Amino acid sequence: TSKMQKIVNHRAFTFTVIALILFNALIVGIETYPRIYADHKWLFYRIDLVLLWIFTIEIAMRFLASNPKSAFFRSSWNWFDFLIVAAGHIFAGAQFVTVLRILRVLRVLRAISVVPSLRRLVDALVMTIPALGNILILMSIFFYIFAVIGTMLFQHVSPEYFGNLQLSLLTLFQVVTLESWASGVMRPIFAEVPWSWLYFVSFVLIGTFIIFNLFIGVIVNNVEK
Amino acid sequence: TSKMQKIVNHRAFTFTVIALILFNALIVGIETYPRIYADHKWLFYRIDLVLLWIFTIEIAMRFLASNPKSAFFRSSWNWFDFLIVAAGHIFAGAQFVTVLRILRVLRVLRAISVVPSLRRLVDALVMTIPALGNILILMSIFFYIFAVIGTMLFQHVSPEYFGNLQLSLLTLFQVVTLESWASGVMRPIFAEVPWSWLYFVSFVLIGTFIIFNLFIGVIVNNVEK
Amino acid sequence: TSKMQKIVNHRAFTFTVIALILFNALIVGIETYPRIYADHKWLFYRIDLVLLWIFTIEIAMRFLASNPKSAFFRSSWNWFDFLIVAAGHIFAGAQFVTVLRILRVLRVLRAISVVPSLRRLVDALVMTIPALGNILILMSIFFYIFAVIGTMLFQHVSPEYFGNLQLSLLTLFQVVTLESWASGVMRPIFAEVPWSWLYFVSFVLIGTFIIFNLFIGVIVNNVEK
Amino acid sequence: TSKMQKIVNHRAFTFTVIALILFNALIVGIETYPRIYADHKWLFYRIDLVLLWIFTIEIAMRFLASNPKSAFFRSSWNWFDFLIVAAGHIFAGAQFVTVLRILRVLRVLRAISVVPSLRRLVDALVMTIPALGNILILMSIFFYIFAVIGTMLFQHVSPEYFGNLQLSLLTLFQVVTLESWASGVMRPIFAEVPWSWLYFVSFVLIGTFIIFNLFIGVIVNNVEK
Ligand SMILES: CCCCCCCC/C=C/CCCCCCCC(=O)O[C@@H](COC(=O)CCCCCCCCCCCCCCC)COP(=O)([O-])OCC[N+](C)(C)C
Numbered sequence: 001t002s003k004m005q006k007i008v009n010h011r012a013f014t015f016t017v018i019a020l021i022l023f024n025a026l027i028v029g030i031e032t033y034p035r036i037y038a039d040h041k042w043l044f045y046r047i048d049l050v051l052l053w054i055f056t057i058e059i060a061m062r063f064l065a066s067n068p069k070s071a072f073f074r075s076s077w078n079w080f081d082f083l084i085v086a087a088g089h090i091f092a093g094a095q096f097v098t099v100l101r102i103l104r105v106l107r108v109l110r111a112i113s114v115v116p117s118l119r120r121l122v123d124a125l126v127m128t129i130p131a132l133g134n135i136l137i138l139m140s141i142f143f144y145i146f147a148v149i150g151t152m153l154f155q156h157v158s159p160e161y162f163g164n165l166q167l168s169l170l171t172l173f174q175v176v177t178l179e180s181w182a183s184g185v186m187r188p189i190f191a192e193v194p195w196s197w198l199y200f201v202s203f204v205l206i207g208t209f210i211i212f213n214l215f216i217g218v219i220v221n222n223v224e225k
Numbered sequence: 226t227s228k229m230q231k232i233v234n235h236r237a238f239t240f241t242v243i244a245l246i247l248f249n250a251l252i253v254g255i256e257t258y259p260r261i262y263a264d265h266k267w268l269f270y271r272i273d274l275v276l277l278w279i280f281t282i283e284i285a286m287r288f289l290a291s292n293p294k295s296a297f298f299r300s301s302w303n304w305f306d307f308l309i310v311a312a313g314h315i316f317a318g319a320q321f322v323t324v325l326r327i328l329r330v331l332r333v334l335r336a337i338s339v340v341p342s343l344r345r346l347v348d349a350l351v352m353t354i355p356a357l358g359n360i361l362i363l364m365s366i367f368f369y370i371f372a373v374i375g376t377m378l379f380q381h382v383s384p385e386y387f388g389n390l391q392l393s394l395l396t397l398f399q400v401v402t403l404e405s406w407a408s409g410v411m412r413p414i415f416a417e418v419p420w421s422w423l424y425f426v427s428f429v430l431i432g433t434f435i436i437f438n439l440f441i442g443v444i445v446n447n448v449e450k
Numbered sequence: 451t452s453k454m455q456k457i458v459n460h461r462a463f464t465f466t467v468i469a470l471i472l473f474n475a476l477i478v479g480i481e482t483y484p485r486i487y488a489d490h491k492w493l494f495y496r497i498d499l500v501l502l503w504i505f506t507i508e509i510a511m512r513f514l515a516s517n518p519k520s521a522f523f524r525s526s527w528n529w530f531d532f533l534i535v536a537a538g539h540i541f542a543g544a545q546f547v548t549v550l551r552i553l554r555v556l557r558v559l560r561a562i563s564v565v566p567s568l569r570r571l572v573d574a575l576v577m578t579i580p581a582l583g584n585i586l587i588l589m590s591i592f593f594y595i596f597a598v599i600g601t602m603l604f605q606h607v608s609p610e611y612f613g614n615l616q617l618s619l620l621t622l623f624q625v626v627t628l629e630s631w632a633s634g635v636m637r638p639i640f641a642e643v644p645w646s647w648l649y650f651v652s653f654v655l656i657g658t659f660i661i662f663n664l665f666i667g668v669i670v671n672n673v674e675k
Numbered sequence: 676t677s678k679m680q681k682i683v684n685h686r687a688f689t690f691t692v693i694a695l696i697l698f699n700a701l702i703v704g705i706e707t708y709p710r711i712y713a714d715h716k717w718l719f720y721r722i723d724l725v726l727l728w729i730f731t732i733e734i735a736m737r738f739l740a741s742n743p744k745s746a747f748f749r750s751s752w753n754w755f756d757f758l759i760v761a762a763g764h765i766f767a768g769a770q771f772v773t774v775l776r777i778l779r780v781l782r783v784l785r786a787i788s789v790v791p792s793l794r795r796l797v798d799a800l801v802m803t804i805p806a807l808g809n810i811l812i813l814m815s816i817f818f819y820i821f822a823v824i825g826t827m828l829f830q831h832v833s834p835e836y837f838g839n840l841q842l843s844l845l846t847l848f849q850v851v852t853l854e855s856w857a858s859g860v861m862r863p864i865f866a867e868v869p870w871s872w873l874y875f876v877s878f879v880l881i882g883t884f885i886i887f888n889l890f891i892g893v894i895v896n897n898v899e900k
């Protein structure tokens with residue numbers, strides 16, 4: 001006999017949870033200002049515990065609502081919720097007492113999993129990755145090649161941008177979004193070594209040609225089916 | 226008996242209205258220069274009243290031309306016209322005597338509602354919003370998350386850009402159009418805190434990936450039907 | 451009897467003309483350097499006249515080759531050729547003796563009309579304009595509105611960018627290609643008047659939303675037929 | 676009798692080669708840092724020879740594995756491999772002893788030819804060029820025209836950007852990716868000669884209109900078939 005999971009299904013529960021999420025966003029936004037936060041700090045304390053208490057129980061409900069002896073964690077969107085809320089308790093007295101603030105902020109992000117028409121949208125929007133999941137390998141290969149060619153040439157011409165392999169990856173990420181690829185990056189270097197342009201004029205091309213076929217390949221297969 | 230709304234329909238009337246609109250644009254453009262305006266101020270006065278008088282009557286015509294006891298205001302494009310022209314009279318002697326100038330400028334904008342092939346174009350171009358009216362919610366959620374994560378980290382590292390929640394929204398709007406996201410925004414901060422790049426390199430990605438599916442989603446459904 | 455326009459049709463003639471065009475490009479490029487030009491000026495003179503003489507006759511041929519008593523000028527691509535080459539002679543001794551240089555440069559541009567697969571490409575690529583020939587009117591209206599709203603507000607806050615109606619059109623053209631719309635244009639102004647952002651944050655949106663439907667509208671009708 | 680090319684076909688061989696490629700990438704990346712390289716230089720030497728020895732033999736295998744008396748070099752992707760690896764030996768004692776380093780870096784690039792689903796992807800991604808292989812000619816013609824018009828006007832107004840035909844090509848490449856086309860390039864010049872804007876406002880248009888039809892033309896034919 002099990003009179004627990006019979007009418008355990010609810011409808012207006014989602015409105016409760018979304019109101020809680022929006023109230024948490026409104027709470028944590030206010031925490032940003034310094035003068036308001038110090039003065040109202042006493043009031044806020046009881047609230048974080050209160051909000052945390054409100055969440056945990058409402059995910060334990062879902063835990064003991066849909067066949068606990070089943071794929072509750074084999075599914076997605078539930079492992080995620082549990083990870084966030086449980087980290088909520090685990091980092092409550094962590095030596096790093098401040099990551100709790102960032103995670104409290106990140107809490108609201110579950111508002112895409114508790115409402116329909118968002119869960120479905122992000123589900124499709126992420127399942128589309130393995131479609132273009134091949135050109136990414138190409139834009140990694142042609143990315144590392146230049147990231148490691150540049151750093152051995154322009155290492156003593158401009159240590160700021162091309163200082164080292166991991167610091168020269170950031171620059172070749174700046175130059176592929178076409179952001180000051182001629183005011184800060186190229187021109188000062190090009191003023192020193194004369195044949196350097198063949199490295200930027202051949203990266204803003206062979207690099208914008210893949211970001212282009214990314215678009216085309218995700219626009220063809222996403223239309224055909 | 227009603228011999229009013231029988232031949233009240235007109236054809237060349239639209240040419241009168243469009244000539245008036247273009248003349249109003251030409252009038253208000255000249256108002257910009259200071260030397261010309263002060264000298265010709267006496268001449269201009271009689272004109273604003275004259276143009277205002279010309280409009281009001283020609284919208285009252287439409288008011289008493291197509292079944293006044295019907296959906297004259299339940300429709301759109303008429304509520305808009307009436308709002309603009311009536312604000313014309315309401316702000317004529319407002320304590321704010323200068324908003325009348327901006328609204329006089331904005332008057333010409335009705336040139337999209339008085340001519341065909343523009344009304345239809347803007348009608349479709351705005352009705353397409355509820356199609357992508359879902360990804361906007363996602364680009365608001367993932368927007369607020371970073372807008373409130375950044376402001377609590379980089380609040381005492383660069384008060385100019387990330388000074389406060391409402392002043393840090395503008396910056397994260399600058400960095401999503403890829404405008405000086407490495408010359409002004411990132412590099413000075415990144416020179417202070419070392420692991421900050423994971424916040425910009427993970428916003429120019431997870432933020433240009435939604436502006437991308439915006440494009441794709443509005444290019445698929447706008448082709449299929 | 452007319453034994454002129456019988457075998458007047460030619461095949462290898464196009465190779466002669468394209469070789470002449472490429473040689474003219476190679477000639478005029480060299481003219482750019484100053485040291486080379488002064489020294490070789492004597493040699494160059496005989497060449498411009500020689501090239502000009504070579505052209506004129508080869509367009510007079512076409513004039514008297516395909517039914518001169520027909521639509522030789524009602525067609526396009528011939529009126530263009532004749533205009534360029536005839537300007538060649540007309541500006542030979544013009545009071546402006548230097549526009550002849552720019553027009554000599556522009557001469558090579560006819561290389562798109564004398565070779566196939568380019569004439570056809572540019573023909574289609576320009577005939578596509580009346581398709582989107584409607585959104586352009588909208589991007590002119592919403593362009594003038596802001597171009598004349600901005601100049602009356604920010605006329606004594608930054609005369610460089612928003613100095614006058616014709617000088618403020620250039621700025622609102624800069625801000626619609628998303629080029630330093632927050633480093634040079636907005637931020638200095640926004641530091642003076644506080645509520646100014648509502649003018650740039652509402653132009654980089656309602657202005658990139660039309661440049662977007664430009665793309666979509668020219669990608670739908672250019673696929674459907 | 677030929678008992679050589681009977682069971683010469685292999686399967687796990689590709690895993691050997693890809694492990695070698697990844698190990699070469701990991702080896703050459705470390706070479707970038709200076710302190711690590713000098714100290715570990717003795718260890719590295721034996722490795723370059725070892726890796727080089729490992730490659731050469733494994734391409735000679737393929738040479739004598741698939742009908743050497745056939746189109747081994749008439750094919751592609753094999754001429755490329757052989758060119759790279761053979762340059763490996765040819766530049767081993769070159770007067771330029773340092774290009775060997777860059778070529779050692781470039782060695783890893785063959786990781787797109789030794790694994791499937793990459794060879795096919797790059798094959799299609801390059802075979803698509805002759806489709807748009809016509810608009811490129813147009814974007815070369817309209818490119819040279821402005822590249823040689825600008826250099827004769829703005830040669831004594833700003834020698835930095837428009838110094839000469841080959842140095843003014845770089846600038847008109849900067850201005851077509853819309854990168855500081857109003858902060859560095861235009862505004863300083865435009866402050867000197869007044870009617871110069873008609874050269875940049877008519878290049879950022881007639882130049883972004885071809886990069887646009889590039890997109891459209893490669894999105895239509897790449898969908899239709
Ligand atoms: C199918 C085939 C795929 C091919 C993919 C190829 C991948 C192959 C992967 C190759 C691995 C890369 C080799 C780097 C190893 C360096 C180790 C090191 O010395 O650390 C140095 C510190 O500095 C760092 O550790 C920087 C951390 C690495 C930054 C990024 C490395 C990988 C990124 C690659 C981008 C990948 C994708 C990018 C685009 C998304 C230590 O030196 P030091 O600082 O002087 O401190 C003292 C040194 N000491 C310890 C001796 C005392």
Ligand SMILES: CCCCCCCC/C=C/CCCCCCCC(=O)O[C@@H](COC(=O)CCCCCCCCCCCCCCC)COP(=O)([O-])OCC[N+](C)(C)C
Pocket residue numbers: 022025026029030033035036111365366368369390391
């Ligand atoms: C489906 C779920 C959707 C989720 C959406 C989440 C939305 C949840 C919404 C949450 C609301 C946000 C909380 C902020 C409230 C602050 C109040 C405040 O203190 O004002 C301060 C002034 O400064 C301001 O008032 C700034 C105005 C707000 C800027 C933008 C806020 C909302 C933007 C969010 C972006 C939304 C989208 C953005 C992208 C389009 C007052 O402090 P002070 O200045 O020091 O002056 C003295 C203080 N004193 C009065 C005590 C004396």
Ligand SMILES: CCCCCCCC/C=C/CCCCCCCC(=O)O[C@@H](COC(=O)CCCCCCCCCCCCCCC)COP(=O)([O-])OCC[N+](C)(C)C
Pocket residue numbers: 247250251254255258260261336590591593594615616
């Ligand atoms: C369907 C409906 C369509 C609606 C379209 C609306 C179009 C309506 C068109 C309206 C016309 C615009 C009105 C401006 C007239 C100013 C005349 C003037 O005073 O000149 C001044 C000089 O300065 C100039 O002349 C600047 C030249 C004009 C710049 C651009 C104007 C039009 C651009 C609009 C952009 C259009 C599209 C833009 C996007 C492509 C003279 O003053 P001054 O310099 O002090 O010199 C002394 C003065 N003095 C002579 C008295 C001694």
Ligand SMILES: CCCCCCCC/C=C/CCCCCCCC(=O)O[C@@H](COC(=O)CCCCCCCCCCCCCCC)COP(=O)([O-])OCC[N+](C)(C)C
Pocket residue numbers: 472475476479480483485486561815816818819840841
């Ligand atoms: C279907 C039709 C197609 C039409 C296409 C048209 C193509 C027609 C091609 C025309 C050729 C161009 C003419 C330039 C020749 C200059 C020679 C010269 O004087 O060198 C100078 C050096 O400086 C250089 O040599 C610069 C090198 C050339 C840069 C790019 C030239 C071609 C680029 C074009 C872009 C093409 C595409 C661009 C977009 C991809 C020498 O002078 P100096 O430096 O003072 O040194 C002393 C001089 N001295 C030796 C006398 C002592």
Ligand SMILES: CCCCCCCC/C=C\CCCCCCCC(=O)O[C@@H](COC(=O)CCCCCCCCCCCCCCC)COP(=O)([O-])OCC[N+](C)(C)C
Pocket residue numbers: 136139140165166167168169170173415416417418419420422423426427
């Ligand atoms: C999700 C985000 C990454 C995405 C995956 C990337 C793979 C992993 C890549 C890198 C991971 C390894 C880096 C570890 C850094 C340790 C050292 C360090 O502190 O960093 C240093 C450098 O900072 C960087 O190197 C940033 C690395 C950028 C990698 C991706 C670039 C864009 C990828 C585009 C991909 C698009 C194509 C599709 C592929 C995605 C900063 O500190 P520092 O070393 O002390 O430097 C001096 C500090 N000081 C100056 C303040 C004094």
Ligand SMILES: CCCCCCCC/C=C\CCCCCCCC(=O)O[C@@H](COC(=O)CCCCCCCCCCCCCCC)COP(=O)([O-])OCC[N+](C)(C)C
Pocket residue numbers: 361364365390391392393394395398640641642643644645647648651652
């Ligand atoms: C239609 C336009 C907005 C669109 C809706 C946005 C929602 C509502 C958002 C904000 C509305 C609430 C802000 C109220 C401002 C009051 C205080 C103030 O003066 O502002 C201050 C800051 O200025 C800002 O914060 C600009 C806000 C940007 C919001 C949108 C950013 C891009 C959205 C992209 C969306 C794309 C994705 C799809 C979603 C659209 C300026 O004055 P101050 O505070 O005194 O600062 C110091 C002044 N001083 C330095 C000069 C001394």
Ligand SMILES: CCCCCCCC/C=C\CCCCCCCC(=O)O[C@@H](COC(=O)CCCCCCCCCCCCCCC)COP(=O)([O-])OCC[N+](C)(C)C
Pocket residue numbers: 586589590615616617618619620623865866867868869870872873876877
């Ligand atoms: C083909 C190109 C134009 C295209 C048609 C544009 C329509 C006609 C528009 C303008 C034509 C009328 C301007 C006449 C200028 C006379 C005065 C003058 O010298 O100009 C002045 C300003 O320079 C400008 O105003 C540039 C005008 C830009 C117009 C188009 C902007 C982008 C359109 C985007 C369209 C995209 C959407 C679709 C619509 C296309 C410069 O000289 P000055 O006044 O002495 O200023 C001080 C000089 N000093 C500082 C050096 C000391």
Ligand SMILES: CCCCCCCC/C=C\CCCCCCCC(=O)O[C@@H](COC(=O)CCCCCCCCCCCCCCC)COP(=O)([O-])OCC[N+](C)(C)C
Pocket residue numbers: 190191192193194195197198201202811814815840841842843844845848
């Ligand atoms: C694969 C990359 C090229 C692509 C083909 C390009 C064709 C061939 C084009 C040029 C080749 C000929 C140039 C030879 C240079 C010799 C002189 C020289 O040193 O260069 C000089 C200039 O540097 C340049 O001129 C760069 C040339 C850019 C050409 C392409 C621009 C973008 C094309 C976009 C195409 C997109 C549309 C589709 C078409 C592709 C640098 O040295 P310098 O002269 O001493 O100058 C002073 C040096 N100092 C200041 C440090 C003191």
